[PDB]
Design an enzyme around this catalytic site. Structure first.
Site, PDB file in Angstrom:
ATOM      1  N   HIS A  61      31.036  28.170  46.845  1.00  0.00           N
ATOM      2  CA  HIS A  61      32.102  27.242  47.194  1.00  0.00           C
ATOM      3  C   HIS A  61      33.228  27.246  46.147  1.00  0.00           C
ATOM      4  CE1 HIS A  61      29.745  24.718  50.090  1.00  0.00           C
ATOM      5  NE2 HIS A  61      28.737  25.266  49.432  1.00  0.00           N
ATOM      6  N   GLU A 107      19.389  27.123  49.218  1.00  0.00           N
ATOM      7  CA  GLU A 107      19.162  25.870  49.959  1.00  0.00           C
ATOM      8  C   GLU A 107      18.193  26.210  51.012  1.00  0.00           C
ATOM      9  OE1 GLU A 107      23.559  25.137  50.488  1.00  0.00           O
ATOM     10  OE2 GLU A 107      22.946  23.069  49.856  1.00  0.00           O
ATOM     11  N   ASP A 131      25.684  27.842  45.441  1.00  0.00           N
ATOM     12  CA  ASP A 131      24.375  27.508  46.003  1.00  0.00           C
ATOM     13  C   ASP A 131      23.535  28.745  46.147  1.00  0.00           C
ATOM     14  OD1 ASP A 131      24.889  24.739  46.220  1.00  0.00           O
ATOM     15  OD2 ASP A 131      26.080  25.111  47.995  1.00  0.00           O
ATOM     16  N   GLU A 143      30.952  25.365  42.912  1.00  0.00           N
ATOM     17  CA  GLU A 143      29.516  25.290  43.143  1.00  0.00           C
ATOM     18  C   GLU A 143      29.000  26.606  43.692  1.00  0.00           C
ATOM     19  OE1 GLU A 143      28.562  22.083  45.900  1.00  0.00           O
ATOM     20  OE2 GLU A 143      26.538  22.738  46.133  1.00  0.00           O
TER      21      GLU A 143
HETATM   22  O1  LIG Z   1      28.747  18.809  54.779  1.00  0.00           O
HETATM   23  C1  LIG Z   1      27.373  19.019  55.168  1.00  0.00           C
HETATM   24  C2  LIG Z   1      27.038  20.504  54.929  1.00  0.00           C
HETATM   25  O2  LIG Z   1      27.930  21.278  55.719  1.00  0.00           O
HETATM   26  C3  LIG Z   1      27.795  22.650  55.451  1.00  0.00           C
HETATM   27  O3  LIG Z   1      28.844  23.330  56.101  1.00  0.00           O
HETATM   28  C4  LIG Z   1      28.501  23.523  57.461  1.00  0.00           C
HETATM   29  C5  LIG Z   1      29.416  22.531  58.136  1.00  0.00           C
HETATM   30  O4  LIG Z   1      28.798  21.259  58.027  1.00  0.00           O
HETATM   31  C6  LIG Z   1      29.684  22.914  59.582  1.00  0.00           C
HETATM   32  O5  LIG Z   1      30.964  22.323  59.817  1.00  0.00           O
HETATM   33  C7  LIG Z   1      29.688  24.441  59.862  1.00  0.00           C
HETATM   34  O6  LIG Z   1      29.673  24.770  61.236  1.00  0.00           O
HETATM   35  O7  LIG Z   1      28.530  25.074  59.325  1.00  0.00           O
HETATM   36  C8  LIG Z   1      28.699  25.003  57.898  1.00  0.00           C
HETATM   37  C9  LIG Z   1      27.816  26.023  57.160  1.00  0.00           C
HETATM   38  O8  LIG Z   1      26.452  25.691  57.297  1.00  0.00           O
HETATM   39  C10 LIG Z   1      27.884  23.048  53.996  1.00  0.00           C
HETATM   40  O9  LIG Z   1      27.620  24.434  53.876  1.00  0.00           O
HETATM   41  C11 LIG Z   1      26.807  22.343  53.263  1.00  0.00           C
HETATM   42  O10 LIG Z   1      26.771  22.801  51.908  1.00  0.00           O
HETATM   43  C12 LIG Z   1      27.102  20.890  53.446  1.00  0.00           C
HETATM   44  O11 LIG Z   1      26.060  20.292  52.745  1.00  0.00           O
END
Ligand SMILES: OC[C@H]1O[C@@H](O[C@H]2[C@H](O)[C@@H](O)[C@H](O)O[C@@H]2CO)[C@H](O)[C@@H](O)[C@@H]1O
Ligand SMILES: *[C@@H]1O[C@H](CO)[C@@H](O)[C@H](O)[C@H]1NC(C)=O
Ligand SMILES: *[C@@H]1O[C@H](CO)[C@@H](O)[C@H](O)[C@H]1NC(C)=O
Ligand SMILES: [Sm+3]
Ligand SMILES: [Sm+3]
Ligand SMILES: [Sm+3]
Ligand SMILES: [Sm+3]
Ligand SMILES: [Sm+3]
Length: 434
Positions: free
Chosen positions: A228, A217, A214, A212
């Protein structure tokens, strides 16, 4: 599943531009399709739902193979049921749309034809678009991204799926999502558990994984750019807790990296670059252009344009990294400063090049976050850290924003509007249209 025609399926049209190194851009005619999960699923021969609220018919649909034989997907009313409209090169997606039921959000795919998704090879090329996020408050996410989905929706590999891309089948992403009703020509009833916090969803026993990218967002407060990687590049079914991703015990136990190597300028320390009003460099009460380039090294470059002025992604100091490109060096420094090893475990930018150098399908959506309330994008997260923790603060929103029932009822007319898609070789998308 198969397809039924009680409601006809007609894809909204959307024009975009294919740009050339020779100085010109040529108009392409596409259309968008809504993802199969939002559709009405009923018996092939009758009108009895196979799925309702968040549970399946015990009679029609007692296992995964049988339920695919008995059930079909119907057409969708894009505007009146799902709040999806297009006009020219522009696409709008509304948040809450009241008709017979209440629909929340939509995920849509760009199409090449009636039966096939448009596949874009990102590596060596650039993608440009315009977006209006003014109507997106805290807690929402207007997303534009790519995923390594099959162009025909799974049809040639899984003959029990005759519906295909015309009905939006085949979705996958790096969360290895298990909320899909149909995966790989079978239903996802073998194992289903309803969501507690959501009337309309649940989690099945299978998920659908793939790579993926992104691109975007964002809402009116914050924005992020995030690749990802996965160990297996393209669509691939996974089983249970071993899927990994957001709703499994070990988020990190699967084939895909659910965190990614994200670049959110506010998170990196620049709190005046992106926001509502003219105290921000980019003013989110107005339309802006976002350009993203996929350099052949596997790095990613970004620049914006608003009211004729061009701004490159801001510079960042992060551990030993200094610069404004999402490369290797940045990804590695991010893990070391913010924590994590998911991204380099699943191969980093190098493994991500295998995705970008094959085809990916364009996805546009609007959604709210039943799991973490979009706090990871626009607030402090986790919610009990403070700014002396590196990367905790991602936007200015309150720690109690984003609860889905809250925002569904207090900003039901939120909307996102994407427009003017252009795609071609690096440096070509600033060319005039035609
Ligand atoms: O899974 C929800 C959301 O998480 C995002 O990663 C976060 C993560 O949740 C957290 O553990 C970390 O501290 O920050 C990261 C980066 O923002 C992930 O990037 C999203 O795409 C996902 O939807
Ligand atoms: C944030 O971005 C703008 C645009 O690049 C820049 O001129 C400004 O100095 C930046 N501020 C900080 C604190 O890094
Ligand atoms: C926030 O809470 C988590 C609970 O997991 C903890 O590890 C972290 O250290 C806390 N931070 C602060 C500043 O209290
Ligand atoms: Sm597998
Ligand atoms: Sm570069
Ligand atoms: Sm290096
Ligand atoms: Sm440090
Ligand atoms: Sm490791």
């Amino acid at each position: 599943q198969s397809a039924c025609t009680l409601q006809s399926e007609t894809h909204p049209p959307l024009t975009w531009q294919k740009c050339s190194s020779g100085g010109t851009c040529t108009q392409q005619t596409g259309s968008v399709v809504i993802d199969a999960n939002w559709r009405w699923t009923h018996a092939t021969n009758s009108s009895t739902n196979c799925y309702d609220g968040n549970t399946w018919s015990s009679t029609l649909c007692p296992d995964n193979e049988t339920c695919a034989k008995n059930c079909c997907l119907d057409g969708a009313a894009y505007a009146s049921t799902y709040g999806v409209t297009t006009s020219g090169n522009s696409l709008s997606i509304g948040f809450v749309t009241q008709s017979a039921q209440k629909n929340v959000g939509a995920r849509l795919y760009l199409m090449a034809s009636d039966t096939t998704y448009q596949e874009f090879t990102l590596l060596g090329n650039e993608f440009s678009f315009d977006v209006d996020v003014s109507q997106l408050p805290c807690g929402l996410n207007g997303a534009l991204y790519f995923v390594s989905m099959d162009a025909d929706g799974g049809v040639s590999k899984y003959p029990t799926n005759t519906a295909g891309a015309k009905y939006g089948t085949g979705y996958c992403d790096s969360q290895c999502p298990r909320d899909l009703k149909f995966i790989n020509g079978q239903a996802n009833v073998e194992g289903w558990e309803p969501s507690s916090n959501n009337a309309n969803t649940g989690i099945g026993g299978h998920g659908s994984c793939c790579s993926e990218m992104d691109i975007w967002e964002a809402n009116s407060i914050s924005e992020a750019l995030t690749p990802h990687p996965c160990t297996t590049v393209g669509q691939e079914i996974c089983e249970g807790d071993g899927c990994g991703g957001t709703y499994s015990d070990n988020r990190y136990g699967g084939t895909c990296d659910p965190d990614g190597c994200d670049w959110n300028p506010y998170r990196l320390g620049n709190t005046s670059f992106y926001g509502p009003g003219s105290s921000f460099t980019l003013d989110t009460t107005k339309k802006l252009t976002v350009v993203t380039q996929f350099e052949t090294s596997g790095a990613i470059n970004r620049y914006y344009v608003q009211n004729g002025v061009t701004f490159q992604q801001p510079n960042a100091e992060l551990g030993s990294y200094s610069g404004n490109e999402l490369n290797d060096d940045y990804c590695t420094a991010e893990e070391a400063e913010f924590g994590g090893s998911s991204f380099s475990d699943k191969g980093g930018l190098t493994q991500f090049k295998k995705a970008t150098s094959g085809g990916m399908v364009l996805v546009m959506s609007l959604w709210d976050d039943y799991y973490a309330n979009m706090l990871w994008l626009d607030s402090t997260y986790p919610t009990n850290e403070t700014s002396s923790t590196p990367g905790a603060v991602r936007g200015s929103c309150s720690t109690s924003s984003g609860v889905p029932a809250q925002v569904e009822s207090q900003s039901p007319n939120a909307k996102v509007t994407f427009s003017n898609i252009k795609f071609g070789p690096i440096g070509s998308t600033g060319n005039p249209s035609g």
